[PDB]
Amino acid sequence: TFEHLNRDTLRYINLLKRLSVDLAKQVEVSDPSVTVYEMDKWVPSEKLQGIL
Amino acid sequence: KGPKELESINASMKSDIENVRQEVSSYKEKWLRDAEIFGKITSIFKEEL
């Protein structure tokens, strides 16, 4: 049982950062002043964030 | 296209149609007044010709 727990802990912690898959990153900004976009500050809409 | 950009361009087209209608009405009134004055002046010229 301890061996199972250790192996599953490695599997889990491996699965968050490395083996992850995220959104598509479609971009649209409303403010007219902004002209350059960092392309990483894009977040999903609150309606999607809560559901996720 | 995206929904936010869609609503934005829709609102923009609505505002553009509104402003175009207003400016067209203003220019039509101005042209009508000026053409009325011009016809009042040119009546005598047409009668003479």
The two tokens of residue A51 are 């559901």
CB contacts < 8 Å between A and B, how many? 6
Cβ pair A28, B2 in contact under 8 A: yes
Helices (H), A1-52: 2-17, 46-51
CB A27 within 8 A of CB A37: yes
Contact B9, A33 (CB under 8 A): no
Q: Which residues on B lie below 8 Å from A26 (Cβ)?
A: 2
Q: CA B9 to CA B15: how far, in whole Å?
A: 10
